[PDB]
Paper text:
In this work, we describe the AKR from the termite [name] (CgAKR-1), a founding member of a new AKR subfamily of potential biotechnological interest. CgAKR-1 displayed major structural differences compared with others AKRs, including the differences in the amino acid composition of the substrate-binding site, providing basis for classification as a founding member of a new AKR subfamily (family AKR1 I). The most related and well-characterized family members in this database are human AKR (AKR1A1) and nematode AKR from Caenorhabditis elegans (AKR1G1). Generally, members of the AKR1 family have broad specificity for aldehydes, are cytosolic and monomeric proteins, and interact strongly with NADPH as a cofactor. Thus, we concluded that in addition to its ability to reduce aldehydes, CgAKR-1 had an NADPH oxidase-like function and could generate ROS, such as H2O2, during in vitro assays.
The three-dimensional structure of CgAKR-1 revealed a conserved structure, known as the (β/α)8 barrel, within the AKR superfamily. This structure consisted of eight β-strands in the central region surrounded by eight α-helices. The NADP-binding site is buried in the protein structure and is highly conserved throughout members of the AKR superfamily, despite the low similarity of other regions of the protein. CgAKR-1 displays structural determinants that underlie the preference for NADPH, which is related to the positively charged arginine residues that bind to pyrophosphate backbone and the 5′ phosphate group of NADPH. The amino acids W24, N47, Y52, H114, S166, N167, Y214, I217, S219, K276, S277, R282, E285, and N286 surrounded the cofactor. In addition, the catalytic residues were identified as D47, Y52, K81, and H114 and were also conserved. The superposition of CgAKR-1 chain A with AKRs complexed with substrates indicated that the substrate-binding site was delimited by the amino acids W24, M51, Y52, H114, L115, W128, R229, F314, and M316. One major feature of the CgAKR-1 structure was the presence of a longer loop (known as loop B) between the seventh and eighth β-strands of the barrel (residues L222 to L242) compared with that of other AKRs. This longer loop also exhibited high mobility based on high B-factor in chain A, which could not be modeled in chain B owing to the absence of a defined electron density. Consequently, the unparalleled long loop B from CgAKR-1 seemed to play an important role, not only in cofactor binding but also in substrate interaction owing to the arginine (R229) positioned towards the substrate-binding site.
Author numbering: 7 to 334
Write the structure that this text describes.
Amino acid sequence: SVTFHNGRKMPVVGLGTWQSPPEEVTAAIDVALEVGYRHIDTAFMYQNEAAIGKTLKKWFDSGKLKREDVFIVTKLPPIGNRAESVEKFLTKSLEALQLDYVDLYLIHLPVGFQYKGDDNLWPRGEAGEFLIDTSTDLISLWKAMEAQVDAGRTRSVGLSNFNSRQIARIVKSARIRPANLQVELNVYFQQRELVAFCRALDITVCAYAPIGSPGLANVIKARGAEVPESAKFDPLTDPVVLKIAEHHKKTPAQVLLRHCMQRDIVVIPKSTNAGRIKENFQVFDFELSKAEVDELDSLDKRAAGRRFRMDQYKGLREHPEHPYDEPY
Ligand SMILES: NC(=O)c1ccc[n+]([C@@H]2O[C@H](COP(=O)([O-])OP(=O)(O)OC[C@H]3O[C@@H](n4cnc5c(N)ncnc54)[C@H](OP(=O)(O)O)[C@@H]3O)[C@@H](O)[C@H]2O)c1
């Protein structure tokens, strides 16, 4: 586990739910909690929160799992990056999860979309134009997040896909500092600089896409987008990681997760598969040498790097709070 600055502990392994359709996410969470997962990462924009709630309500009502024993993470949709809309969406998230509180609430994206509808995650105009909110003000938005911990709807609040300057701006204004930053991170994109930046401010880094995102290429092409060349790199096929995997008699995925975890970095591998779910949890048992760490450190591609880029549309790159123009 990793402990936030406010003293709350966060499990270092959680189960990602993007993209886990509700037909699959319910059984996958049943499997995850049987495995030992005590941390679930979801979001309002993933459209699986209601299914998670169904499974959680079963384990809470029936089974021997207490709510204080599980760590629930959801996020504010880019269509709510305005202080006024924050409690609306978290209230909507909570009732789908059927919980009275989440453990961690993140600003999903620095870049806001104009709210053109509650259930309209990707808003368009009279023309096919993509409705972006040029007016995203983070200081104001963050104060609404702070007000959510005071209402007890969330125990901690944090940021996702934010850069240094925007984290620094928020923390220097923060009545309650960010508890967690969730950015893309794996051995091909280790984010050395941003982790050390956050650790200096006692901000814990949760790593999404920790074993690379193999499904993502097919997902980017499913949406109207172009598959980046960094998405053509599989860190589970890399010979370095396979060599280290045989040394420990472990699988590449667990090697990749381990490398993150021993940097005190939370990781949320996403899996529908009941075997692969179990596979990614059996990772608290082995320690990586100081020498295999540096072979894994050599694998880092730093900038680009990113497969989860934010350059699909002109107005999105040109939005004043675009995080990936800065070095980190
Ligand atoms: N902007 C954001 O904040 C953002 C965006 C996207 C995702 N995320 C977070 O990251 C989580 C997903 O991360 P990801 O799925 O992008 O990265 P990833 O988990 O590293 O890639 C997961 C993919 O690899 C497969 N896989 C999972 N465990 C495996 C294993 N042990 N061995 C081999 N293959 C395995 C899965 O296939 P099966 O499903 O068939 O197992 C899935 O397609 C999401 O739930 C979300 O919480 C955050």
